[PDB]
Amino acid sequence: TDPRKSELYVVEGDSAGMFQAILPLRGRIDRVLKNTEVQAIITALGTGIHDEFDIGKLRYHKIVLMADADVDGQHISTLLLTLLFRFMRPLIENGHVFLAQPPLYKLKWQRSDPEFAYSDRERDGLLEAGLKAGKKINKEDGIQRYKGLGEMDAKELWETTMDPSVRVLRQVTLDDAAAADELFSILMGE
Amino acid sequence: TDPRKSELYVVEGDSAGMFQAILPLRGRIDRVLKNTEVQAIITALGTGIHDEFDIGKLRYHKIVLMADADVDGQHISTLLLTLLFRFMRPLIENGHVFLAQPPLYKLKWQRSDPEFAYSDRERDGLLEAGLKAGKKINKEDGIQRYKGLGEMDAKELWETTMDPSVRVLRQVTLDDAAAADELFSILMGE
């Protein structure tokens, strides 16, 4: 439960699923700060914002953003990384911010546990290794290509994106957050 | 992600682990409302408090409190049910508040999936049924008696307390919340 042993997952957006807290974010910067879901995330982090930001009050060692690979999922991650870059910058600078890579494929092996691939390369690798081991797979429907997080059952979502020994996390750098901030400014101007 | 398909789990306290949001609560009523963890829970619910309470702004269909059976776990559940009874009463009245019953025992069957018991009666029943079916168990260490939520691995905690088809939930009635409020007042006076 301790901040050092605590993580906060922010699950985005309209196609959604060590202490692991979880908060949603569904989907004008002043209007976004008034949004209830945004307010809950900011409050849970416990640092305060802008000039009131206090790193010592950080409630979570890791902040993990989880969204779909599509434009809808990108839009929400862009929004949250911009809010963090503009009002809670040391969270990014000190390496607390991460992006969860959801699995792209589920390999439905006939008489064994299903395997999950995070890229086309891993899918091909796992398929070859499985067939070589003697595992069986249906050529027509044995490989499920995920379209969103909502397609996964809650148990497999945890196994693939939240289990620390299995999950694929990418650290958000200051340059990554600056690129999200630029993207936000471009889209607002459009 | 929709409020109707959303649940908020409040995991208590110092011995801790359909969209399922999760928030911690570790462990003078005016001082409690200023606490960051309490503020995050209230904010996530989205209704506001006291005269500002708006049922229409409720972000979660179910509010589930999960704590250890000991005095430490009871103290936190007493505190949160009191806050809900005093400042967010319709959440209890409208049947949104529940208590999660964590498993008391894990039956470590030798060559099959482990089973979980929520009472001494269920433990005895499952043990008899398993041995009758031909399942094997070690008489010395095969039955683990849980002392707290922190003893469970994250995956089994979800399977037993968060899976809607498996979990054991008890609805918090207005009388239940009134008894928690009385208990809080007695302990504060002590």
Domain ranges of chain A: 1-100+169-190, 101-168
Instruction: Give resolution, Å, one decimal.
Output: 2.0
- My answer on whether omega of the bond before B13 falls inside 30° of 0, hence cis, is yes
Long-range contacts of B102-106 (CB under 8 A, 24+ apart): B102/B66, B102/B68, B102/B69, B102/B146, B102/B149, B102/B152, B102/B157, B102/B160, B102/B161, B103/B146, B103/B152, B103/B160, B103/B161, B104/B69, B104/B145, B104/B146, B105/B143, B105/B144, B105/B145, B105/B146, B106/B143, B106/B144, B106/B146, B106/B156
The C-alpha atoms of residue B48 and residue B67 are separated, in whole angstroms, by: 24
Q: Is the separation of the CB atoms in B107 and B127 below 8 Å?
A: yes
Instruction: Name the one residue in this structure whose structure tokens are 């005093």.
Output: B86
Bond from prior residue into A13 cis (ω within 30 degrees of 0): yes
Which distant-in-sequence residues (6+ apart) come within 8 Å of A107 by Cβ?
A: A114, A115, A116, A117, A123, A126, A127, A130, A137, A142, A143
Which residues of B have a CB under 8 Å from any CB of A?
1, 6, 11, 13-24, 26, 36-37, 39-40, 43-44, 46, 57, 59, 154-155, 158-159, 162-163
Residue positions forming the annotated binding site of A for Mg(2+): 12, 68, 70
Q: Report which secondary-structure segment, H or E, holds B100.
A: strand B97-100
Token digits for A161?
């994106």
Q: How far, CA to CA in Å, does B90 sit from each of A145, B37, B49, B172, B176?
A: 43, 22, 11, 12, 14
According to DSSP, the β-strands at B97-100 and B62-66 are parallel
Provide the 3-class DSSP secondary structure of residue A105: strand
- Comparing CB atoms, the residue among A23, A46, A163 nearest residue B44 is A23
Distance CA A34, CA A36 (A): 6
* Correct CATH for A1-100+169-190 of 3.30.70.20, 3.40.50.2000, 2.40.50.180, 3.40.50.670: 3.40.50.670
Residue with tokens 């600078």: A93
Q: Which long-range contacts (C-beta less than 8 Å, at least 24 apart) are formed by A30-34?
A: A32/A79, A32/A83, A33/A83, A33/A87
CB contact under 8 A, A1 and B13: yes
Q: Tell me, what DSSP letter sits at residue A186?
A: H
Q: Which member of B15, B17, B158 has the closest CB to residue A155? A: B158
Q: Are B43 and A36 a contacting pair at CB < 8 A?
A: yes
Catalytic residue, candidates A7, A51, A52, A68? A68
Q: How far apart are the first and last CA of chain B?
A: 43
Nearest to B37 by CA among B11, B55, B59: B11
- Tell me the technique behind this structure: X-ray
Torsion angles phi and psi, residue B177, rounded to 5: -65, -35
Whether A36 and B21 lie within 8 Å, measured CB to CB: no
The region that residue A134 occupies, defined by phi over 0 for left and psi between -120 and 50 for alpha, beta otherwise, is left
Could you give the CA distance from residue A45 to residue B25 in angstroms, rounded to a whole number?
A: 14
Rg (CA), chain A: 18
Task: Extract the tokens encoding B157.
Answer: 């905690």
Fold agreement between B1-100+169-190 and B101-168: no
* Cα gap B188→B190, rounded to integer Å: 5
Topology given in CATH for the domain delimited by B101-168? Dna Ligase; domain 1 (3.30.1490)
Query: Measured between alpha carbons, how far is A113 from A117 in angstroms, rounded to an integer?
Result: 13
In chain A, residues preceding a discontinuity (C to N beyond 2.5 A) are: 17, 27
Cα→Cα distances A38→A87, A115, B155, B181, Å? 13, 34, 28, 31
B165 φ/ψ angles, rounded to the nearest 5 degrees: -80, -15
| A14 contacts on B by Cβ (under 8 Å) | 1
Chain A residues lying within 8 Å of B46, measured CB to CB? 36, 40
CB-CB under 8 Å, A16 with B1: yes
Give the gap in angstroms from C-alpha A12 to the nearest C-alpha of chain B.
9
Q: How far is B37 from chain A (nearest CA, A)?
A: 6
Would you call B1 and A19 a contact, using CB atoms and an 8 Å cutoff?
no
Using CA coordinates, name the residue in chain B closest to A58: B36
Distance of CA B180 to the CA centre of its chain: 15
Q: Determine which helix (DSSP H) or strand (DSSP E) holds B44, and give its type and residue range.
A: helix B36-45
Contact A155 B154 (CB under 8 A): no
